[PDB]
Amino acid sequence: GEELFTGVVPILIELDGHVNGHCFFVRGEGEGDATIGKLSLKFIATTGKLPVPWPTLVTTVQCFSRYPDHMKRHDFFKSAMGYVQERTIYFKDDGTYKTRAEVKFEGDTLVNRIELKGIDFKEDGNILGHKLEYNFNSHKVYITADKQNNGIKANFTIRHNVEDGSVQLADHYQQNTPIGDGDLPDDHYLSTQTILSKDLNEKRDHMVLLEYVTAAGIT
């Protein structure tokens, strides 16, 4: 399973989005290696301007996260190889995201097909009002093991920067389970870093992504 991430692997990402009766779709193309922990993706909104700000959709392909030589026994995301990634995103004082995504290989490209449903967001609120900065800070992904579902649970809170100077908290609860039968880890975490940019020659509503993710927690 690990041997598939030895080098560059092309990425395909599709997102089915439904928030407060607004339907949108996002295509994601790019590359990424797990030896460095790098991701380079360009997301395109093929349905005009998004009804929600980009940074909220960032959180919803860990498998390209770098696991050091002494932690290679703890990468569920690679052992699967696919898995499904379910999430619930609690935006504080704001709506919520339910997310289900299948992540498997399709030949050369690694594919992440997503469906999300946004419920009870506030009009002229921080999300539906696009009062979010085009930013993203660094975060930790606290990962534990789940023997009951042969998978993994994880908890973290994302800090979205607001235009006024305050901070938005999007509490994330996620569950992952393998698709095919056939390695759960100990309590570790994934340190993440992210830059949001744009292609100056794309007229479509888009987002360029650069990520660096590594693991830690085990000496």
Pick the stretch among 12-20, 58-66, 84-92, 176-184 that binds its own copies (CB under 8 A).
12-20
Cα 110 from Cα 31, distance rounded (Å): 9
Q: How far is the CB of 181 from Cu ion (least distance, A)?
A: 31
Q: How far, in Å, are 33, 116, 197, 210 from residue 42 at the CA level?
A: 16, 19, 9, 9
> For its own copies, which is the closer residue by CB, 186 or 199?
199
Judged by beta carbon, residue 23 or residue 179, the one nearer its own copies is: 23
| Residues engaged in binding Cu ion (CB under 5 A) | 16, 23
What is each CA distance from 109 to 2, 92, 131, in whole angstroms? 15, 36, 35
Rounded to a whole number of angstroms, the minimum distance from the CB of residue 123 to Cu ion is 7
Token representation of residue 1:
């399973």
Q: Where are the beta strands (DSSP E) in the chain?
A: 11-19, 23-33, 38-45, 83-91, 96-106, 109-119, 139-146, 151-161, 167-178, 188-197, 206-216
In terms of CB distance, is 56 or 168 closer to its own copies?
56
DSSP 5: G
> Could you say whether residue 122 binds its own copies (CB under 8 A)?
no
Whole-angstrom distance, CA of residue 156 vs CA of residue 177: 18
- Cβ pair 157, 170 in contact under 8 A: yes
Residue closer to its own copies, measured from CB, 5 or 24 = 24
Q: Which is nearer to its own copies, 115 or 171 (CB)?
A: 115
Taking residues 15 to 54 in sequence order and writing x for each that binds its own copies by CB under 8 A, - otherwise, the string is -xxx--xxxxx-x------------------xx-------
Residue 27 binding target from Cu ion, its own copies, none, CB below 5 to 8 Å by type: its own copies
Dist. CA 16–CA 9, nearest whole Å: 23
Number of residues near its own copies (by CB under 8 A): 11
Least Å from the CB of residue 17 to its own copies: 8
Residues that bind its own copies (CB under 8 A): 16-18, 21-25, 27, 46-47
